[PDB]
Each structure stands twice: as structure tokens, then as C-alpha cells.
């Protein structure tokens, strides 16, 4: 009978104006709201579309182009996944964070663009 409902707004993490000098280590976040009519449990997993230019160990990341990467996080986790629980009906928030560059930044700046998939596995 249908379940939790995430907000419909487009999810775009905007870093805005960025200078080739001061572009790395920038940070920007987006907040996705989720309303459930019954107590619930949802597992969120990040999946990469754009391939990372650099290596980041265990941290999840995507490619923003022109020699630039981004470490994406959910609810403050860089690991790549997190679970949210509703002990009762209501709205809970999931925050997505984005930190730039990493490793050997021998960039070639010029308008960054990238993307990742936020998967919700329902029990």
C-alpha cells in the first residue's frame, strides 16, 4: 500500500562560483526529506555513475570532470551508506555532503559536472 515518500525536489549539490586556485576542499550539502506514515527502516546506498579521477581508499567518490573529484557523504558518513529508522510516523531528513578534489590535484578547471545514485533498499 505504498510506503515512505521522499521529497520530489531535484537533488543538486551546488558548489557555485569556484576559482581554480580555491576550488578543492570546498563543501556543499543538500537535504532530502522523507515522510513515512508508519514506523519504518530504510537503507541508503550511494552508487557511482561518473568514474573518479583519483583513488580515495574506502571513501565514496565521483568524477566532476576536468581533473576534479568529489567525496560524497550521507548523514555525515563517507563510507557510502547509512540507515535511517522511523520509530513512528513522521518526517526524517537525510543530508548529502560533497567535498572536492583529493590526492594529486593536477586539474584543468572549466565548469564541473558529475553525478551519483542514491539507492534506497526497502525491507
Amino acid at each position: 500500500i505504498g510506503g515512505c515518500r521522499p521529497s520530489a525536489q531535484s537533488l543538486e549539490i551546488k558548489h557555485g562560483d569556484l576559482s581554480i586556485n580555491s576550488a578543492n576542499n570546498h563543501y556543499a550539502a543538500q537535504t532530502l526529506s522523507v515522510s513515512c506514515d508508519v514506523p519504518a527502516n530504510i537503507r541508503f546506498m550511494l552508487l557511482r555513475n561518473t568514474t573518479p579521477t583519483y583513488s580515495h581508499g574506502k571513501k565514496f567518490s565521483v568524477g566532476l570532470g576536468h581533473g576534479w573529484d568529489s567525496i560524497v557523504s550521507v548523514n555525515g558518513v563517507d563510507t557510502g551508506e547509512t540507515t535511517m529508522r522511523w520509530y513512528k510516523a513522521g518526517t526524517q531528513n537525510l543530508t548529502i555532503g560533497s567535498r572536492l578534489y583529493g590526492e594529486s590535484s593536477k586539474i584543468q578547471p572549466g565548469v564541473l559536472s558529475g553525478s551519483a545514485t542514491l539507492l534506497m533498499i526497502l525491507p
Binding site: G2, P6, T117
Partner: protein
């Protein structure tokens, strides 16, 4: 932006196909919707025994539509006395960003898709979950599922409220199987699960020694 109408899907094997309603809840932007099936190990499969159509479609803002799940002849290779597990996936594709320096996040939803052969079709007023058996053992309970259906257990406590509020790691029992979980000892165990429709019933157990069954 693109939502689904349920949390799990049951495919009655007596039918040839069924549909699921999807909706683009975003009112300003059009989205593409990708649908596909994965096997029990979450590996995408494109040649059956179960398929989704269309693989991709466009939804204007606020538009409503659906995805059709169908079977191929190979569906007969599956066991007929129990459920087989698949997963349904729906991933959105937002329009390219109009601004510069942007990380787009696309939502995807995966739900359990239960293939239920006609041979084990149930009567809409039947509850196979009350056949479950809880055997008290060191550290918890050995839960038995003698039915031909998958059972998703979400709660287990000493009381009704504990079963539905208490912290518990959800486990899904495959048909005709058993699994052991850690937990305190309860004089009158209460277990909660999620049924075919998303309902979350609670079962009260009575114990005969270390053997507990539904009252």
C-alpha cells in the same frame, strides 16, 4: 522525484503479468524512469525469467504511469512449491543541470519481488505467518519457517510494544528454513512482520517449554 506505489511486489504465478504504478512527483521537471529486474543475488538480468517493460520511459512533471512485469517461458524452470526471490528497481534520470559546478543526485528504489507459483497461491484471508515456530536456545531463538513463502521479521520482544518499538535487526527467512537470532528471553514472545500489503501485524506466542507457537 519518481515514486513507486508499494514497498514490495507479489507476482501471482497464475497470471501472465501485472503492473506497478509510478509517479513523477516533481512539478517542474520532466524525468526519465529506468526499470529493471535483478535475481536473488541482486544481479541484473535481462533475459528472464521475469522482465520489466518498458526499460525506460519519460514522465512530464506530475505525470503518472506504470511499469509492467511479465514472465518468459523459462518461468517453468523455477520450483513450483515455493517462492523465488527477485528485486524490482526503479531509477530516475533528472534533466541535465542548468547551472555550473553541480553534483546531481538521482534516486533509485529497490524492492523485493516475490514470484509465487500458482501451485502455492494463497486465499486472501490466509495467514501462513502463524505457523512460525520459536525455539529458545543459547542466546536467543531459533526461528522456523515451515511455509513456502519468504517471511520478513521486523520485531521480536517480550511485549506487543517491544515487538514494534524495540530495536531489532530485521531478518528475512527463506521458505522452509530456519534462522537463529540473539535476544533476551521472553515469557510471552511477540513477533512482528511485514505482509504482502505492507501491513505490520504482531503475533503473540505461547511457549511449551522452549518451544513457542502462535496462540
Amino acid at each position: 522525484a519518481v515514486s513507486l506505489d508499494r514497498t514490495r511486489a507479489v507476482f501471482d504465478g497464475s497470471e501472465k503479468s501485472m503492473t506497478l504504478d509510478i509517479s513523477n512527483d516533481n512539478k517542474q521537471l520532466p524525468y526519465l524512469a529506468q526499470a529493471w529486474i535483478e535475481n536473488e543475488n541482486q544481479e541484473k538480468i535481462i533475459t528472464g525469467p521475469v522482465i520489466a517493460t518498458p526499460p525506460v520511459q519519460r514522465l512530464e512533471p506530475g505525470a503518472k504511469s506504470m511499469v509492467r512485469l511479465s514472465t518468459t517461458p523459462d518461468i517453468s524452470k523455477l520450483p513450483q512449491d515455493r517462492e523465488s526471490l527477485f528485486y524490482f528497481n526503479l531509477r530516475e534520470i533528472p534533466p541535465r543541470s542548468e547551472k555550473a559546478n553541480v553534483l546531481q543526485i538521482a534516486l533509485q528504489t529497490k524492492i523485493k519481488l516475490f514470484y509465487r507459483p500458482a501451485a502455492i497461491k494463497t486465499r486472501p484471508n490466509e495467514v501462513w505467518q502463524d505457523q512460525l515456530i520459536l525455539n529458545k536456545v543459547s542466546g536467543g531463538y531459533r526461528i522456523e519457517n515451515p511455509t513456502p513463502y519468504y517471511v520478513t521479521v521486523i520485531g521480536l520482544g517480550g511485549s506487543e510494544k517491544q515487538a514494534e518499538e524495540g530495536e531489532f535487526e530485521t531478518v528475512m527467512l527463506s521458505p522452509r528454513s530456519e534462522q537463529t537470532v540473539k535476544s533476551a528471553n521472553y515469557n510471552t514472545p511477540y513477533l512482528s512482520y511485514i505482509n504482502d500489503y505492507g501491513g505490520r501485524p504482531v503475533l503473540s506466542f505461547i511457549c511449551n517449554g522452549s518451544r513457542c507457537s502462535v496462540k
